[PDB]
Amino acid sequence: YKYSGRDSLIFLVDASKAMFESQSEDELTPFDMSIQCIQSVYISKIISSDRDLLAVVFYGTEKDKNSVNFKNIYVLQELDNPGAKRILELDQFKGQQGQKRFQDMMGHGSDYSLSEVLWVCANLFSDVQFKMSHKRIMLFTNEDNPHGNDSAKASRARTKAGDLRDTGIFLDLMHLKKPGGFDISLFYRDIISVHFEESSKLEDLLRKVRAKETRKRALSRLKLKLNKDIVISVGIYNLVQKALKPPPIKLYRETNEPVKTKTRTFNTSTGGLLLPSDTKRSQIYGSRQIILEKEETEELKRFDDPGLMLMGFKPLVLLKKHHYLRPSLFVYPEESLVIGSSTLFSALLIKCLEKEVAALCRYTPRRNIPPYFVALVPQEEELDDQKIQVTPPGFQLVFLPFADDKRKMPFTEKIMATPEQVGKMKAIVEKLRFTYRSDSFENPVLQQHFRNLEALALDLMEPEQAVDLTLPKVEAMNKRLGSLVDEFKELVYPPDY
Amino acid sequence: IHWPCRLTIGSNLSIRIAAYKSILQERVKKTWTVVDAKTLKKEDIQKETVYCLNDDDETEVLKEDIIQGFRYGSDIVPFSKVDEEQMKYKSEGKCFSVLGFCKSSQVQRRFFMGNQVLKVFAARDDEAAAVALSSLIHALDDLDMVAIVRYAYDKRANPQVGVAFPHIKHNYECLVYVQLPFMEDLRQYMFSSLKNSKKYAPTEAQLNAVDALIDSMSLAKKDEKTDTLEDLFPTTKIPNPRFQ
């Protein structure tokens, strides 16, 4: 879908006693399972996408809250952006005492009707003003025949859920270990888009996974001036960009209210609230003072207008991988401007890969920025993993240093090791061989930070303290490697350290 | 600047290491000072960062009444700057220690993610380190294997990961260190894939034009028998036009 549309998601639990207070074991509880799910996807969505909408609803309860079509349904929460007080409302109903806390309020086991329940949720999504990209309902019921004993009750539901799917709201399901069996082919076969224990999907809602997830958006758009005249529009996209702990919002102590930092400039002698025109900019050199205006400290540092000028072609081997400037950015075509320029770009991509070549360009991302120099290395897609595109096809902008960047480094000379000293090393190295994958690690600080933030925010008894994956697991490095550190200590240097 | 440390492939075996930054995206030494338009004196302006509560200009005192918060969904939560330091992830040392090794194939071009590049060298006048590290990197020159390493410049600063990538020059062994992404620094998008060319046609005459462009506008010319081309535009030897 288009950029702005929120994900929006409504959670809809069976309040019926026959599941709600029920267990075959003692070790879980289907309502305590669903509520855990709702709290846990909801705490995922809080860290990861505060912009996307959640609601939660109980059907078949005995005391009601709805707009209309009231009987035996209670909207615990209408659609809203997610936060702490909502997670605190769900927390109240959890656990052995929780399954009594709920009973003092909304009441349990009464008759219900899916064609009314699906009506209610529909009205909910309608009532909200925002643009929605995905509209999804989640069923937390075990009741595999949903009391369609009256087939002329049940045909209402099936038609109404035809109407859900027809209006482009989706609906989705989880089965919840009903004693002895559950089978979708009896009923729910036509409500969703051979026999089950409990859903292999449901564990994915307990991943508790944390990052920002920020959708595909351009960094900027530019014109690749091949010369004085021929241009194509290309995008500039950010495939790799270091995340930061979110900017902290300064607060008033006594009320927790946000407060404005409200800075001014004031003359050291006098009451002049000096305006931006009152003051210049300056330097000191050679015991004299150089004076420039607030226009020209940024008229200096201009050279060009936003674009990409072509500078001719190179071998890919001469672009030496030791000197690297800043993270590489992707280039991909954009018919939003320069229509049909995709036809040129695609031929340019295809044929550079045959030539074993890069294009060299000069690059300005904005007006009032100096040109850097950038090699456009061409790119090719590994769809072989059943069209999981690990690599998009296009170009990489790889940046190149200038003289000033390549800092001087001290004198040293040696070519010291013998073939035995390499030969022992060639063993330890081959014993320590693993497979790195790009996603195999996580930031120890930024992951810890969210766990501290939750303890403070949901008022938890403890920080979760989940230990990081960057420390070497040194006992495994002792054992897999084995004792071979002694080959350095014996064969390579004296015993004095 | 010099930085002294201890390269550590396993719990018992440490070697002395002292790295230097090698590429840094360089910035000018002297900032633009701020000066009064008529007096031309660099201290006739004081920069009052004053504060407001919005209840008709109640002005706060930062030393008593302002406490940083973070933001958590639809609501704000107050920390204390002095309780973040009580709970913050603290590195146990000014570490450098290898996690393991794997092929050049595990580490594609694009992903490199650093502010700087280090050159990571045997400590001055340590002839035991000189033989040991020359062994280390000579044993990486031939396998196409690369190292993966936890790093940290100093105490309190963030822990760090990535690729310690070897190379060779006739006067010294190279092994640069560069940062690589954590799982949340990496963005995955399915860009609509271009080999489905039926609506964006690359026809025979278009291809047969481009076939001559990319040979014709070559900078590198084959005026050699070293198999190194003329290097007709040596952009890494040019001075930065910003400072000129």
């Binding site: 879908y1 994900d7 990209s133 996974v209 059943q386 999981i388 994956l469 495994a476 | -």
Partner: peptide, 23 residues
């Protein structure tokens, strides 16, 4: 389609479970 797309956070590609060094 389903195979790579997360149920917690749709359209976005499924976050695999952190990994680390293990031989």
């Amino acid at each position: 389609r389903c195979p790579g797309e997360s149920l917690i956070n749709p359209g976005f590609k499924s976050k695999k479970p952190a990994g680390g060094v293990d031989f």
